[PDB]
Amino acid sequence: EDRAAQSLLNKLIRSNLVDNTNQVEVLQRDPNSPLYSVKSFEELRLKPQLLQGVYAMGFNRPSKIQENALPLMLAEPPQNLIAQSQSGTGKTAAFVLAMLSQVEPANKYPQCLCLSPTYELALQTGKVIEQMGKFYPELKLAYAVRGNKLERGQKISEQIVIGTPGTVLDWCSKLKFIDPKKIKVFVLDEADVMIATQGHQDQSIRIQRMLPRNCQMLLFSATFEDSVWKFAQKVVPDPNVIKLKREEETLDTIKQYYVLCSSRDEKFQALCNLYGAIAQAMIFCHTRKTASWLAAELSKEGHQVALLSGEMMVEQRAAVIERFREGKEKVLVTTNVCARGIDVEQVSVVINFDLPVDKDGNPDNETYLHRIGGKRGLAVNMVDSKHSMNILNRIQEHFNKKIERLDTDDLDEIEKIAN
Ligand SMILES: Nc1ncnc2c1ncn2[C@@H]1O[C@H](COP(=O)(O)OP(=O)(O)NP(=O)(O)O)[C@@H](O)[C@H]1O
Ligand SMILES: [Mg+2]
């Protein structure tokens, strides 16, 4: 639920590319045509002011996905593209670079159009445009979003437009703010998020149908879900397709344990004995009340922990995650919802204060694999009722790797796991 907020949070805390060891699968529209992949930005002959912006942003080498996407997007005649790769692989930097290659800042009208699922996500993309194109003196950016106060009769002179589908459609047709036949590059970013809203699909297609045939069409998604793929086929005609499989999570270098408990207050005491061993840790709870209650009790017992709860704005969650990464916080308590799909790094211990279960009540094996884990990690699961023990064993059955019973009372066994 709310993929747009999860996506926004990952943007705010993302500091570098995610390392992927898989290979890029390329499906060109012409299977006879060769596969051209570059390994440096000089190989692309970018405009000097654009290469300057690329280097000024700390980029020195194309990312894995960019090695194939950049030469394909800069080829003549323009090639359309549907690209799929996990968050943090450089999809956004890729199409920003493509947009900045085709824009002529002397022509004071929109030439590149990008659709974002939300205003906040549009702002994140606009920041990348502002950075990479900061050596384009006359280059200006317009935000076609609901909050924009624009009186009729004006014709926007910004060369790049980022916006949400509803407002962009109004600007291109009804309100006559954009002439769509002058658009040279069209991007639909975060298609996996965009489809979460019913109206967005129809609006995005209607916008695309107004563009000229010589306009380059680009679509990017974090996931390869069939619904996104079917939507993408309706948006991008005659597409090349690029895919980078998500980096697998092995689970083999992590010691798993579970603690039988009589009640909740037992789980708190059992957690206290463990805390001595540690080595930042994340603690996952089902309800905000559990997370708030647990975070408070840990403070009373002499330890400061960061809390991740739903009343916090996305910007506050990012600030807490950043402090946790910088070591200022040694332990982070979070609900399942606030942590679902968030790429938190620098975690070596996971405490499943509550076992991850889907809305069907069954085990959430996907969430379990994502939280845990080639560096040694530790996973402690807190069982309470017999139901929870029935669940835990189903997890143990799923992965077929044993979760040894930890005896929280015995401090000697706690040192054994710490090894
Ligand atoms: N060629 C590059 N070299 C180094 N860092 C890069 C490069 N391209 C992008 N990055 C960085 O890698 C991170 C992810 O880049 P970004 O373009 O936002 O990825 P993404 O695939 O669009 N993410 P998402 O929109 O959440 O699916 C950011 O910190 C970028 O600054
Ligand atoms: Mg992206």
Numbering used by the authors: 54 to 331, 334 to 428, 434 to 479
Task: Give passages from the manuscript.
A comprehensive structure-function analysis of DDX19 indicates that binding of Gle1CTD•Nup42GBM induces a conformational change in DDX19, thereby stimulating its ATPase activity.
The inhibited state does not differ structurally in the presence of ADP or ATP, as the nucleotide-binding pocket readily accommodates the additional phosphate and Mg2+ ion, with minor changes in the sidechain conformations of K64 from the auto-inhibitory helix and E243 in the nucleotide binding pocket. DDX19 is predominantly trapped in the auto-inhibited state, which can form in the presence of either ATP or ADP, although the ATP- and ADP-bound states could exhibit different dynamics for release of the auto-inhibitory helix. To gain further insight into how Gle1CTD•Nup42GBM binding facilitates DDX19 activation, we compared the structures of Gle1CTD•Nup42GBM•DDX19∆N53 to those of apo DDX19∆N53.
